[PDB]
Design a protein around this motif. Structure first.
Motif, mmCIF file in Angstrom:
data_model
loop_
_atom_site.group_PDB
_atom_site.id
_atom_site.type_symbol
_atom_site.label_atom_id
_atom_site.label_comp_id
_atom_site.label_asym_id
_atom_site.label_seq_id
_atom_site.Cartn_x
_atom_site.Cartn_y
_atom_site.Cartn_z
ATOM 1 N N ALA A 181 0.821 -1.207 0.000
ATOM 2 C CA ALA A 181 0.000 0.000 0.000
ATOM 3 C C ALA A 181 0.857 1.260 0.000
ATOM 4 O O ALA A 181 0.642 2.168 -0.814
ATOM 5 N N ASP A 182 1.829 1.343 0.914
ATOM 6 C CA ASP A 182 2.625 2.569 0.984
ATOM 7 C C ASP A 182 3.478 2.748 -0.270
ATOM 8 O O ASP A 182 3.599 3.863 -0.800
ATOM 9 N N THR A 183 4.061 1.655 -0.771
ATOM 10 C CA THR A 183 4.867 1.731 -1.986
ATOM 11 C C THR A 183 4.033 2.202 -3.171
ATOM 12 O O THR A 183 4.483 3.045 -3.957
ATOM 13 N N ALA A 184 2.814 1.676 -3.315
ATOM 14 C CA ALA A 184 1.932 2.150 -4.374
ATOM 15 C C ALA A 184 1.563 3.613 -4.201
ATOM 16 O O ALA A 184 1.535 4.354 -5.189
ATOM 17 N N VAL A 221 -1.281 6.571 -17.489
ATOM 18 C CA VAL A 221 -1.081 5.139 -17.333
ATOM 19 C C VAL A 221 -1.547 4.720 -15.944
ATOM 20 O O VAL A 221 -1.678 5.539 -15.033
ATOM 21 N N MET A 222 -1.797 3.423 -15.799
ATOM 22 C CA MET A 222 -2.182 2.825 -14.528
ATOM 23 C C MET A 222 -1.079 1.876 -14.080
ATOM 24 O O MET A 222 -0.804 0.877 -14.755
ATOM 25 N N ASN A 223 -0.452 2.188 -12.950
ATOM 26 C CA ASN A 223 0.574 1.316 -12.402
ATOM 27 C C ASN A 223 -0.040 0.008 -11.913
ATOM 28 O O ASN A 223 -1.197 -0.050 -11.488
ATOM 29 N N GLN A 224 0.760 -1.059 -11.980
ATOM 30 C CA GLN A 224 0.257 -2.383 -11.629
ATOM 31 C C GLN A 224 -0.005 -2.519 -10.135
ATOM 32 O O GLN A 224 -0.854 -3.323 -9.727
ATOM 33 N N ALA A 225 0.706 -1.751 -9.306
ATOM 34 C CA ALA A 225 0.490 -1.820 -7.866
ATOM 35 C C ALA A 225 -0.920 -1.373 -7.494
ATOM 36 O O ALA A 225 -1.569 -1.987 -6.639
ATOM 37 N N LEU A 226 -1.410 -0.306 -8.129
ATOM 38 C CA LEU A 226 -2.756 0.179 -7.837
ATOM 39 C C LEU A 226 -3.813 -0.841 -8.241
ATOM 40 O O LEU A 226 -4.782 -1.061 -7.509
ATOM 41 N N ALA A 227 -3.649 -1.468 -9.410
ATOM 42 C CA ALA A 227 -4.598 -2.491 -9.840
ATOM 43 C C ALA A 227 -4.581 -3.691 -8.901
ATOM 44 O O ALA A 227 -5.639 -4.237 -8.551
ATOM 45 N N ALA A 228 -3.386 -4.118 -8.488
ATOM 46 C CA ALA A 228 -3.284 -5.230 -7.551
ATOM 47 C C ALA A 228 -3.956 -4.896 -6.228
ATOM 48 O O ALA A 228 -4.662 -5.734 -5.655
ATOM 49 N N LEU A 229 -3.748 -3.676 -5.725
ATOM 50 C CA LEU A 229 -4.395 -3.269 -4.482
ATOM 51 C C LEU A 229 -5.907 -3.228 -4.635
ATOM 52 O O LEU A 229 -6.640 -3.645 -3.730
#
Lengths: 52, 31, 51, 51, 53, 50, 80, 31
Positions: free
Chosen positions: F42-45, H3-11
């Motif tokens: 969460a924090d990294t994102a 763009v949409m980063n993959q971390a946001l989609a995963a979260l």
């Protein structure tokens, strides 16, 4: 992380905090309140005294 | 932009599976 | 991932890069890489990122 | 014979210590498990203030 | 561990000293092997060694 | 008799000590590793949006 | 190493210029000097990292997690 | 373009799954 509570006195809320000093071995409390004021229109108030 | 490393995703999946796995003639089959 | 830059490439511009996620800047400033004679050898992009 | 009541009390205290000593690390795990399962903030206990 | 105490009319220990946690250890060491060995010929077992145990 | 009635989930006698177990103890490590993974994602994102 | 560094730093005083062999010798001596004092630091754990059940931690102590957090600096001087 | 980063989609996916998972002989099966 300080014990606290809220008191009420004629529609006014006052926050009380309780804490202590370690080495000196002394306990203390404190009460606080934060006011704010406005003046909408100065032409709607003043001072009145008996005229001669 | 931010990225998600493979190790974190693998750990997420593995821990999610393991939580369900560890925590659990008809009566004997029940936990 | 963290970008990698030189000391002389970002000096005086750290405040813009520090708050790139809270504010909405139109762009980010950076300097080019120069040798001891003042000639430009690399662009203004960061050298790389961590893995 | 332990005629006095005071003589009967330190025996009880010694028995309490003898009963408490062995079963000390098991009840710790039991209480920790109950707290980890029910207390809303109990799953991060031991590192609550960390930064 | 061993400690020491203080005396104060009210408990004010702001300017005094405190006990420090000095830790010592007791060290043990191994010795030397105790070895007993015997030796005899095969023929001695063949014709002369009886009641060996 | 002593009027105390004990209740156990699972009970064993291993080394001169009675040992008990419930249904939460065996899953403490994976859960508190999952929590850390979620927080660290969460924090990294939230660090670098675009 | 010190002599080569000083010699390189005080050539322009006498209006002269170094030579490639002296430069190579100075570089080698500097590398030898830097090798002796080299120290490689190690990364310690975060402080919110769980410690496994195999370490036999206790609820008695804060050993349930790795240390190094510096918490609870509360007191007077409010607005914090 | 954006763009949409993959971390946001995963979260997003993980939180959506976890909300449904956490919030829930026939009677005993019901929440």
């Amino acid at each position: 992380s300080i014990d606290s509570a809220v008191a009420t006195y004629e529609g006014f809320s006052i926050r009380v905090h309780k804490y202590a000093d370690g080495d000196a071995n002394v306990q203390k409390m404190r009460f606080d309140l934060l006011p704010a004021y406005v003046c909408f229109n100065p032409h709607m108030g003043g001072q009145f005294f008996g005229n001669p | 932009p931010a990225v998600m490393n493979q190790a974190l995703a693998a750990l997420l999946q593995q821990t999610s599976a393991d939580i369900q796995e560890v925590t659990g003639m008809n009566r004997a089959d029940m936990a | 991932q963290i970008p990698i830059v030189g000391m002389e490439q970002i000096r005086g511009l750290e405040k813009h890069w520090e708050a790139r996620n809270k504010k909405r800047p139109a762009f980010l400033p950076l300097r080019e890489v120069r040798d001891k004679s003042g000639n430009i050898i690399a662009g203004a992009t960061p050298a790389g990122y961590t893995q | 014979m332990a005629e006095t009541l005071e003589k009967k009390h330190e025996r009880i205290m010694l028995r309490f210590d003898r009963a408490y000593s062995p079963q000390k690390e098991v009840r710790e795990k039991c209480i920790e498990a109950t707290r980890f399962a029910r207390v809303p903030g109990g799953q991060w206990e031991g590192a609550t203030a960390a930064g | 561990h061993q400690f020491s105490s203080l005396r104060t009319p009210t408990g004010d220990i702001s300017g005094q000293n405190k006990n420090n946690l000095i830790s010592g250890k007791a060290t043990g060491r191994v010795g030397n092997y105790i070895t007993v060995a015997v030796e005899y010929q095969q023929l001695e077992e063949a014709i002369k060694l009886n009641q060996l145990e | 008799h002593i009027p105390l009635i004990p209740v156990y989930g699972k009970r064993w006698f291993i080394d001169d000590i009675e040992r008990v177990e419930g249904h939460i103890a065996k899953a403490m490590d994976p859960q508190r590793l999952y929590n850390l993974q979620v927080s660290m994602l969460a924090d990294t994102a939230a660090q670098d949006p675009g | 190493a010190v002599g080569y560094q000083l010699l390189l730093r005080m050539l322009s005083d006498y209006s002269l210029e170094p030579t490639p062999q002296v430069l190579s010798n100075a570089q080698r001596s500097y590398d030898a000097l830097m090798t002796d004092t080299l120290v490689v630091p190690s990364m310690r754990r975060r402080g919110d990292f769980p410690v496994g059940q195999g370490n036999k931690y206790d609820v008695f102590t804060s050993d349930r997690y790795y240390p190094g957090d510096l918490p609870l600096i509360d007191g007077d001087i409010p607005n914090a």
